[PDB]
From Swiss-Prot:
It comes from Halalkalibacterium halodurans (strain ATCC BAA-125 / DSM 18197 / FERM 7344 / JCM 9153 / C-125) (Bacillus halodurans). Keywords: Carbohydrate metabolism, Cell wall biogenesis/degradation, Glycosidase, Hydrolase, Polysaccharide degradation, Secreted, Signal. (1,3-beta-D-glucosyl)n binds at residues 361, 365, 432, 440, 444, 504, 514, 516, 520, 673, 678. GO terms for molecular function: carbohydrate binding; endo-1,3(4)-beta-glucanase activity; glucan endo-1,3-beta-D-glucosidase activity. It is found in: Secreted. Residues 2-696 form the GH81 domain. Cleaves internal linkages in 1,3-beta-glucan. May contribute to plant biomass degradation. The active site is at residues 440, 516, 520. Residues 226-324 are annotated as: alpha/beta subdomain. This is Glucan endo-1,3-beta-D-glucosidase. The lineage of its organism: Bacteria, Bacillati, Bacillota, Bacilli, Bacillales.
Length: 753
């Protein structure tokens, strides 16, 4: 009737009568709602609706907000599609010294508007189709229709007309520098270079005026890299091949660690003989990893400058990238030179901790904290305390994973609900617009998966599908479903082409979609790898490995700029805190200080965090910049996160800072995150830093033929760590020739007591 049973748990199918707990705060109350009733999609788009996309504002707004199908920005309006390109004169880097914020951004301008001869009063723009990274937006006014196909990594906009023909409208007359009749090369008054293409014999008119017209029912627009007729001729070749399908298919080679992704389009010919293929514009995280076999397809001098650096052109039907999955762990092992009694004391101290809210995010942080403590307790021989932590995790998850109370009625809080309209699992209490905007499901549900993965590491029975595993796998499907999932869209959070997750479900911003905590995305992927390994689910594990590895490639480019090629020279910070489709900010979604604008992309620290240490010059450079700005090691907030980060390259320094201040305050205090961030503990901090002191640096040059491992290197001496989730012993082969044997349900070394 009102809930669906899933193993021992359930989800609500009717919106619950929310228990507000006597809280009258309007913000809190408004959070306990649902996503928008109205979805702007045609009747060609059925089933669970895609969210968390670069193009989402087209689905949520009557028209759209500003979008970034790089190299373009575009926006839908009643009058047609505005097209823009941020040239260097449009780009700015601004600093607000007192706020401690920086902003790299362009403009919301219009180079020209793509229009329909029959109307400039479209009623709405709807999603008419989409694939892994393109969208087809349909401007509708009865018989008059204009379908616009566009995407990230597409230097083409394809335009299909019903009951009318093409118009390009400009505020200032453009320079048409090449007139081939049906094909034109033109520049805006401010020297931005474009081209337009119509079928042979359909010639452009209005050359020299503010309005270019064509009788065709099909045109394409290209952004040209240069004012270059040879480039124009190359763009002609693919200007009539409209992208209909686009898939990012991947494989994980467990033996080598290689994650291979092939990006393939299928096009439809708009003139006789049009090739099946396109010109792709690749982002840095793609071309820096281009497969050998795709190199011949590069159009070497075809570059575009965008917010994310330089895009490069590549021609054909497909291209491939190759990445290396580095492994993850369920926890750091027991390899530190800590005082064991001191660590045991901190473990017991952590029993004072409690969640600082009732919503999925604050409860999430708390269960992540307990799940992080439990293996450390096992290591210290405190098995009863470890069991206390896991029992608390079980109590919390067995509550939240049930939608009904003892009487069989729907609960008013601590439950999950399936919104059928969009097709998404929502948790109440909600926060950060997790329900009202479908935000952050990876960030929040990642913590639930962490808790489940830690339970599963000790208790396989609990994790079985007919027990509590079914509900955990439901939460995972919400945020990273495979294809053809009856309840959820494909890989909700992830944008396979941009290479990162997008946190906002709706994308109703003029900067496109955004992601702030890339580390909470990586945490979600890590926990799915662990959960799936523990529960013997290879297909799920491998999908999470693909996500972890691809997301890592985008983080190192766009959040860290480890290669020092992307951020403008005049940008002061050594991190971008929030990445948007159209801009980059050193700023947070809440009013914060200096440390948080770095550390929100580090936290939480867990056994999947070692990707943060692959680039030690970056770790040094970022730390030194933060230290310069603070002016000392007196961190304004979250000191322990800074010490843990510093330990990636200088554990002696991290240790001395930790010794000086870790015991400044006593037990858990929600009002005071100066020393310990509220999702962290003294026990975790002390265990992490001492482990890194003994282990040395992350060594990403060594891979393994199983997925749950790490390799460290201290002055040339390697330490190899494997956790074995199997009932059987395993042998692990490393890429440097090292080979180890691991007993069931154990680390190879540092199991502790
Ligand atoms: O210290 C008290 C102080 O804490 C602030 O809580 C912040 C969260 O606002 C912050 O939320 C992040 C989001 O902006 C986004 O990246 O997604 C998730 C949430 O879904 C979070 O990463 O997270 C940090 C780290 O956990 C918290 O410290 C409160 O906002 C603020 O009012 C309060 O004064
Ligand atoms: O987009 C993903 C991101 O969303 C964050 O929530 C933001 C809200 O913080 C923001 O709140 C607005 C304020 O910034 C402004 O000062 O006032 C208005 C009017 O009250 C507020 O609505 O609103 C946007 C939507 O416009 C939300 O997306 C979440 O905190 C963050 O977790 C999430 O990743
Ligand atoms: O960019 C991070 C900051 O986002 C701010 O919200 C902005 C909105 O007010 C505006 O309307 O949209 C843009 C994107 O087009 C947003 O940047 C928040 O107010 C800040 O707290 C946050 O740092």
């Amino acid at each position: 009737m009102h809930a669906v049973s899933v193993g021992k748990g359930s989800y609500a199918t009717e919106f619950p009568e929310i228990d507000f707990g006597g809280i009258n705060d309007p913000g809190f109350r408004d959070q306990q709602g649902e996503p928008p009733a109205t979805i702007y999609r045609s009747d060609r788009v059925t089933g669970p609706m895609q969210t968390n996309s670069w193009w989402g504002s087209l689905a949520v707004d009557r028209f759209s907000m500003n979008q970034y199908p790089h190299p373009f920005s575009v926006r839908h309006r009643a009058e047609g599609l505005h097209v823009f390109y941020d040239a260097p004169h449009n780009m700015v880097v601004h600093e607000n010294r007192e706020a401690g914020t920086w902003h790299i951004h362009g403009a919301i301008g219009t180079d020209f508007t793509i229009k329909h001869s029959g109307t400039a009063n479209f009623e709405q723009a709807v999603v008419d189709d989409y694939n892994d990274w393109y969208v087809r937006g349909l401007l509708e006014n009865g018989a008059h229709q204009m379908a616009i196909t566009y995407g990230v990594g597409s230097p083409y906009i394809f335009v299909e007309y019903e009951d009318g023909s093409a118009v390009l409208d400009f505020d200032i007359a453009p320079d048409v520098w090449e007139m081939n009749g049906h094909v034109i090369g033109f520049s805006t008054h401010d020297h931005k270079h474009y081209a337009a293409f119509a079928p042979p014999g359909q010639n452009w008119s209005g050359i020299g005026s503010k309005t270019l017209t064509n009788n065709a029912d099909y045109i394409a627009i290209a952004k040209l890299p240069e004012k270059d007729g040879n480039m124009l001729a190359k763009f002609e070749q693919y200007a009539y091949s409209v992208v209909r399908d686009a898939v990012a298919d991947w494989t994980y080679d467990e033996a080598t660690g290689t994650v291979t992704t092939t990006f393939e389009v299928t096009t439809e010919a708009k003139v006789q003989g049009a090739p099946d293929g396109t010109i792709f514009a690749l982002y840095p995280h793609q071309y820096r990893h281009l497969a050998s076999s795709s190199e011949n397809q590069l159009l070497q001098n075809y570059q575009y400058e965008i917010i994310r650096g330089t895009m490069i052109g590549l021609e054909g039907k497909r291209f491939t990238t190759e990445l290396t999955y580095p492994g993850v762990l369920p926890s750091l092992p027991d390899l530190g030179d800590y005082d064991r009694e001191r660590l045991i004391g901190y473990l017991h101290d952590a029993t004072s901790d409690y969640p600082t809210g009732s919503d999925t995010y604050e409860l999430g942080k708390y269960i992540g904290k307990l799940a992080t403590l439990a293996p450390i307790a096992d290591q210290m021989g405190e098995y009863e305390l470890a069991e206390q932590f896991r029992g608390e995790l079980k109590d919390i998850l067995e509550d939240w994973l049930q939608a009904t109370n003892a009487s069989g009625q729907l609960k008013g809080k601590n439950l999950f609900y399936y919104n059928e309209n969009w097709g998404t699992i929502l948790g109440y209490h909600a926060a950060h617009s997790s329900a009202t905007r479908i935000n952050d499901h990876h960030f929040h549900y990642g913590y639930f998966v962490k808790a489940a993965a830690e339970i599963a590491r000790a208790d396989q029975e609990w994790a079985k599908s007919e027990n509590w595993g079914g509900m955990i796998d439901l939460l995972i499907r919400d945020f990273m479903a495979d294809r053809d999932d009856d309840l959820f869209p494909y890989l909700r959070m992830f944008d396979p082409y941009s290479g990162n997750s997008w946190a906002d479900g709706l994308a109703t911003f003029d900067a496109g979609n955004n992601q702030q905590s890339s580390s909470e995305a990586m945490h979600a992927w890590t926990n799915v790898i662990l959960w799936a390994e523990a529960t013997g689910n290879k297909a799920l594990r491998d999908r999470a490995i693909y996500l972890y590895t691809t997301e890592m490639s985008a983080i190192n480019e766009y959040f860290f700029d480890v290669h020092q090629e992307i951020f403008p020279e005049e940008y002061g910070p050594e991190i971008v805190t929030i990445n948007w489709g159209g801009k980059m900010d050193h700023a947070t979604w809440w009013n914060s200080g200096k440390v948080e604008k770095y550390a929100i992309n580090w936290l939480p620290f867990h056994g999947g965090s070692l990707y943060l240490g692959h680039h030690p010059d970056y770790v040094d450079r970022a730390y030194e910049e933060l230290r310069r700005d603070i002016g000392s090691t007196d961190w304004n907030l979250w000191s322990n996160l800074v010490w843990m980060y510093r330990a990636f390259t200088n554990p002696d320094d991290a240790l001395q800072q930790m010794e000086a201040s870790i015991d400044d305050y006593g037990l858990f205090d929600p009002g005071n995150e100066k020393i310990i961030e509220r999702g962290s503990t003294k026990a975790q901090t002390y265990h992490w830093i001492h482990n890194l002191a003994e282990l040395g640096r992350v060594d990403p040059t060594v891979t393994a033929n199983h997925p749950i491992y790490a390799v460290f290197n201290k002055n040339g001496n390697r330490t190899y760590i494997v956790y074995n989730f199997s009932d059987s012993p395993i042998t692990v082969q490393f890429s440097d020739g090292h080979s180890i044997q691991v007993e069931p349900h154990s680390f190879n070394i540092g199991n502790g007591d």
